[PDB]
Each structure stands twice: as C-alpha cells, then as structure tokens.
C-alpha cells in the first residue's frame, strides 16, 4: 500500500495568544513518514518544512510510528504571521528524503486564520 | 477561507479493468465548492482538473452540497495510465474561481495515490 | 448541441432562518456557461446577477463544468426579503458575452420565504 | 489547419535516453510564410490531457528555452540536472496562423527517458 491519509488536518480560526493543534494519521506499507509543512500562500515556492521547536519552541511536533503513523502539530502564543496553509505530508517511498520536494509525497492541507483580539 | 477536510481521499492499488471510487467530505461556512484534480507526477506543473465525462466517459463526478460538501470521483475500466496522484480541492473563498491566479492559491488540497497494476 | 436544460431549478417555500439550494444542469456542445439571476418581481428591470459572496456572504454559487454545466445556488439565513424569482441562465453561444441577452435561455423558480412566527 | 497555416518542420526534436544528473538539448527548426511561432510542450503520458506548455525558467531554472525568429524559427530546449520525472514526451509546436493565439498548430514529438545511476 502506498501511503494514504486516514485522519487529515482540519482548518481552524483562532485568536492571537491562543493555541491550535492539527492532527495527522496515515497508513501504508512500509509505514509512511510524516512531515509538517507550511506556506503563507498556497503555492509550491512558499512551502517549507516545520519541526519540533520551530519558531523559538512555539511550534511542537509529536510523531509516533507503528503499523501506522500519527502526529500532532501544536503552535502556541499564536501571532498573525502564523496564518497560512498547513500540511501533513506522508510518504513510504524509499527515495523520499533524497535531496521539487513534494514529488514522492502526498499532502493534506488545512487553513489556519489567526485574528487579532478585537 | 475556512473550508476544511473532514474526510480526505484514500490511496489505493487496483488492477486493469477494475474501477475505483475516491471520496471527499468538507466543512465550511459558507458551503465549500469541491473539485477533483490529477497529475502523473506530484508537481504543480502536471496537475489538471478532472470532470464528469472525462477519459471517454470513464470518469464520473457526483457532488452534493448542503451544509457540507460531499463528492465521489469514480473511474471505470482502469488502465495503467490512470495511475498517479489524485486530489480533492475545496474552497469557499469568493475569489476561488478567478483566473488571474496560480490555481491552488485560494484552495486547499487532499491527495491520494492510485496505482493500477496489469492483470498479468 | 445548443445549450438545453436537463434539470431546471424548482420553486420552493421556506421559513425564515432556513437555507435553500437551487440546482441547474445544462447540456450542450461546447459545454454551456451558467449564471444565476434574481428579481423581486418577474420584470426585466428587476433582474440582476447573483455572485458568490453576495448578501453578506449568504449567497454561494458552486458551478462545475464537465460534459454538462452543473450549478448549485445556495442562500442561508433566509429572510422575508429573499423571496422572489430566481433564474438559471445558460448559453454556449460563442459571442454570448460580447446584441443583448438574446443568446441565453432561462429557467425560473419562485422562492417564497415565510416568517417563523 | 490546412487552410490558415503553412509552417513546416525542417528540424525536429530527437528522442534520447539520459542518466540522472545529466543534461539534454532538443532542437526545432520551422519554415513558412510568414515566420512561424514556436512553442515547447510536454506530457508524462502522450495524451492531450497531460500536455502543458513549457517556458524558459521552468522547473526551478533547470528548463531553458532559447528561441530566435529570423526568416525561419529556430529553438533549443535544454533541461539540466535531469531527474526521473523529466522523462516523458516533449514536442515542438509551430504555427503561422494569424488566429494561432485566439487547433491550427502542428507538432513534432520526442521521447525522453531518464535512468538513475544503475
């Protein structure tokens, strides 16, 4: 089985200072890798990988692997510039990390909108 | 600006001659539009919109809109060249259908891989 | 194939607070363009075009162009003032957008909204 | 196309097999009265739904297009640092129809096959 999404991240609107969590759950054989990506504008030139501890540890990534892969992306103390398009990426392609990055992966996107308190 | 995927399409392996169905389920206020897109290689240069009747009518699309958007993409009599990356796209942005824009900019995407194997 | 309605929108009665969805399905070769128009009274002077996002984003238009043109018009949080004649217009005439609107066909539906009293 | 077009191929792109990391160059040379326009198109699978126009700078500048119009039209398509995903059908399209940009184009196709380092 090529990687497939069983749970996808879900768009959400938030207030600055709040926090959000996005979830990802993927199946396949071999077990797929999960990565979280982001772009201000939903276009390939804008997408970059996020990681546990990004943005001075406002960003947290907890990922676990078994038969399936599961992950939560969490961002606290939200700012306006956290708005944009977030993405769970999954692949069990053996060449998936060989240095256009989306070519061997699948993607499932969510929109995050952060509004200013009043 | 608020559409989200409740259920995204699921990757699958099929044999030549069979059929597949992909399913896409989305929430948003107002109700988001749904589209289906495809590419042999998962890069924006190769993605094109599929539609009801495509590929000599082997492709059907059935979509229903209420509070949610729900759609099924079905392709019958599968061939090797039906393999690739398929994609549900959703949006309720009022400018989602303007032409002066990289098609993905006002949409969100949820992808599945379809592999079609030769009966032999 | 000249643009032709395979399914035309159907008149409905609603109560305030509800939503309605009208449906328009047109065949043709090439595939016809679809527009939605509205008027309080069925007179030419009162018809104007509905756009996605109108009426404080209570108006949605989701149109798909395949073999057929298939469109749904949805309006939420219905008020008494949303009552009227709603119309799907279709055309695959090459100069349909370039000679007034004589190149489009119309199919109408009445939406009557009553107070949830 | 027989009524409002008369351009014709004098040099056509040539199929070729290459290794990942290498570069290729395809050539097109077209005659007619008036001078015909040249475009380069590509598809993974030789079918109309997959064909898209390429341009100078495509694929993160790996794709180069150099076209000159004198009496005839001549053009070179170059792709460097080749990947497996550069494989497929490339074609030169040409037309000297007035309405050509509003089919009244003609095409000459080549197959590119990229193999990895064994």
Author numbering:
A (entry chain A): 29 to 127, 130 to 148
B (entry chain B): 29 to 148
C (entry chain D): 29 to 126, 130 to 148
D (entry chain C): 25 to 126, 133 to 148
From the manuscript:
Plasma membrane Ca2+-ATPases (PMCAs) have a crucial role in this process by extruding Ca2+ against a steep concentration gradient from the cytosol to the extracellular space. Native PMCAs form heterodimeric assemblies with the small transmembrane proteins neuroplastin (NPTN) and basigin (BASI). Here we present the structures of mouse PMCA2 in the presence and absence of its accessory subunit neuroplastin in eight different stages of its transport cycle. The structures revealed an overall classical P-type ATPase architecture with ten transmembrane helices characteristic of the P2 subgroup.
NPTN was clearly resolved in all NPTN–PMCA2 structures, including the immunoglobulin-like domains Ig2 and Ig3. The most N-terminal Ig1 domain, however, was highly flexible and consequently less resolved. We therefore determined its structure by X-ray crystallography and fitted the resulting 2 Å structure into the density of the E1-Ca state. The resulting combined atomic model of NPTN represents, to our knowledge, the first complete structure of NPTN. The Ig2 and Ig1 domains of NPTN do not interact directly with PMCA2, but Ig2 appears rigidly tethered to Ig3 by means of two hydrogen bonds.
